[PDB]
Amino acid sequence: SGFRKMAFPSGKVEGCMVQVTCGTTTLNGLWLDDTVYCPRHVICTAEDMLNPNYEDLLIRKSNHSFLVQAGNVQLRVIGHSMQNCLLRLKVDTSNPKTPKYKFVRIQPGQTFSVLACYNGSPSGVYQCAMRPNHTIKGSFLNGSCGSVGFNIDYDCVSFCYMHHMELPTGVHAGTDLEGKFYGPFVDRQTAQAAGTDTTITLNVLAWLYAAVINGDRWFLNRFTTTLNDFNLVAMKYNYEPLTQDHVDILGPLSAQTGIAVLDMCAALKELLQNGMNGRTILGSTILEDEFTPFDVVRQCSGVTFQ
Amino acid sequence: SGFRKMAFPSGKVEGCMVQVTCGTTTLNGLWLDDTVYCPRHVICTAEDMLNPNYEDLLIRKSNHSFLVQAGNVQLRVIGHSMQNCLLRLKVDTSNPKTPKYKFVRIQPGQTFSVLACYNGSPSGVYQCAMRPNHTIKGSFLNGSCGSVGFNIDYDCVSFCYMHHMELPTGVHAGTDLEGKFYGPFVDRQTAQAAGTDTTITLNVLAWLYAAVINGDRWFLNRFTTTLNDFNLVAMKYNYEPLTQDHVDILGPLSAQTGIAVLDMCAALKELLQNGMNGRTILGSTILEDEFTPFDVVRQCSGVTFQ
Numbered sequence A, B: 001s002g003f004r005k006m007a008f009p010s011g012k013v014e015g016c017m018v019q020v021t022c023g024t025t026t027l028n029g030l031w032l033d034d035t036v037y038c039p040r041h042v043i044c045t046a047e048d049m050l051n052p053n054y055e056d057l058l059i060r061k062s063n064h065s066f067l068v069q070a071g072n073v074q075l076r077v078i079g080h081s082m083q084n085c086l087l088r089l090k091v092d093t094s095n096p097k098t099p100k101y102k103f104v105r106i107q108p109g110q111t112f113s114v115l116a117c118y119n120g121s122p123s124g125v126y127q128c129a130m131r132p133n134h135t136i137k138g139s140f141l142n143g144s145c146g147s148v149g150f151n152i153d154y155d156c157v158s159f160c161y162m163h164h165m166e167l168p169t170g171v172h173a174g175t176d177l178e179g180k181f182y183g184p185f186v187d188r189q190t191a192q193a194a195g196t197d198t199t200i201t202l203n204v205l206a207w208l209y210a211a212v213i214n215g216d217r218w219f220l221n222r223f224t225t226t227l228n229d230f231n232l233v234a235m236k237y238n239y240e241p242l243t244q245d246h247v248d249i250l251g252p253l254s255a256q257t258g259i260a261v262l263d264m265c266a267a268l269k270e271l272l273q274n275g276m277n278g279r280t281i282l283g284s285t286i287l288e289d290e291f292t293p294f295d296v297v298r299q300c301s302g303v304t305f306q
């Protein structure tokens, strides 16, 4: 029993982390086979950031402009390209520790583990959700750029995030492993800000199912709601509209607990309207929205505590 | 910026995890050099648990009663001993992946990362604190016994916990890597329950310092308190008594923020008495107590956002 924000074991990823220095800038890179991935902003100076032309900055660089360190060993760069907001540095060695991997672009609402790293050495791991406004609530200091987000299936690592910057609200922005930013953000010093965020409705509902699987039913009620009547309440509390697709995804949890989704929706409507009254749900006083339906199934028992 | 419950990278530990089967019971073990550590209750049947004599159960076993699997490979047992509530199984191979390690008994209030594992394969990692009542609020299902808790310093793994059982309240109990239980608990089916718990005062205070380093001062006040006047309030809200040792440990955070500890104590007294008033502290509506002073220093900036 119990319910914790749980990250994937980080070992397959720790063996891919390297250090990347270009001039006086140090950050992290990801070394798979014979390539090292890293934020392109590694090439920039301070003043460069107000106005960088990356094509123009990169043409002025040779292979040997880049020092890549894997643990104590230096890896020699023998090739480079730019792909969107990333550099792809080809090196003399294939990583002996490259795992089975894939690159994926994850969707808002989905979660991933972040391996926070400094100077190519992993310091910590935690679980994040991609917010609706395309930021993550990470924990990052200067030096963390190039740290990566991931999910693991069987023994394949699905890389989904590389960290590039902190916004003024203290939340974090970056790209997929194709160098394409999540969100409207750009790797230049401008007045960009996180857009207004929304609560992830699907995740909240999943988490109420988790609470029921774990043995708590207090928050249920006799009522039901239509999809449409729920959403009018949802909009008022700054929750995402629930869609039929979302209802269908919640099928298996629904089945395991014998609580119809629209009945769970009615319970939620009542929680939003009345509060929790000094009560907790899985040890929380607020409604949690960083656990997907997938996460609940991975973690919780296949057998409900009726 | 930001503040997350952060676990240590788990790679050095993932390479130590094995599977241990004795009859129809499967669990996890820890393989360092030429030894595999695991809960002694692996030898028990269902009925055994009402009344086990472990010395008597173990004498009836040969080396080859035990199957240990490391990934796909079987490791042959060539020796065994019992140490307190653990078995120590000597095997034919030294683990090529044994890291620099130590065994430590941690103290209530301190935190550690848990690598949750099933059938010798790591499934997730999260951060736990040892509660004052000597349990952890873990997330564990059947098959997780033998999963281990740890801290990492430099490249040394300090192993501190092995999981043995779930109590009726859904919290988790186990031992150090000497097989000695944390808490008054025993590996037999009796009516044992978690004792009443306490809020970890030292950690709460550390976490208020974290909030200040990160840029939030709302909860501070003009007041000060004596150690003694604080504790009378503490006892009333079921918080641990603050001691001078605790005051001294909070020195560096105090210095970095320029808030005297007893001034922080006064702020806390005021939070306990008045509540937070629908406000949050580092994204939390409740006062968090699972981050030590050490954890705050590891994670937070060395420079305050004044």
Ligand SMILES: *[C@H](O)[C@H](Cc1ccccc1)NC(=O)[C@H](Cc1ccccc1)NC(=O)/C=C/c1ccccc1
Pocket: A027, A041, A049, A140, A141, A142, A143, A144, A145, A146, A164, A165, A166, A167, A168, A186, A187, A188, A189, A190, B001
């Ligand atoms: C990379 O290592 C570093 C990561 C970082 C820095 C500070 C806090 C948390 C993480 N980030 C950067 O080098 C980027 C550079 C950049 C600048 C503009 C656009 C794209 C990239 N710099 C930052 O992320 C700093 C932003 C910031 C810091 C403090 C307060 C407000 C904003």
Ligand SMILES: *[C@H](O)[C@H](Cc1ccccc1)NC(=O)[C@H](Cc1ccccc1)NC(=O)/C=C/c1ccccc1
Pocket: A001, B027, B041, B049, B140, B141, B142, B143, B144, B145, B146, B164, B165, B166, B167, B168, B186, B187, B188, B189, B190
């Ligand atoms: C080990 O793999 C397994 C871990 C577990 C089991 C259920 C839920 C979470 C974790 N635990 C056990 O085999 C122990 C055996 C044991 C029994 C008595 C004393 C010492 C050890 N069994 C449990 O932990 C189950 C306790 C329990 C389960 C459900 C509801 C209440 C109590």
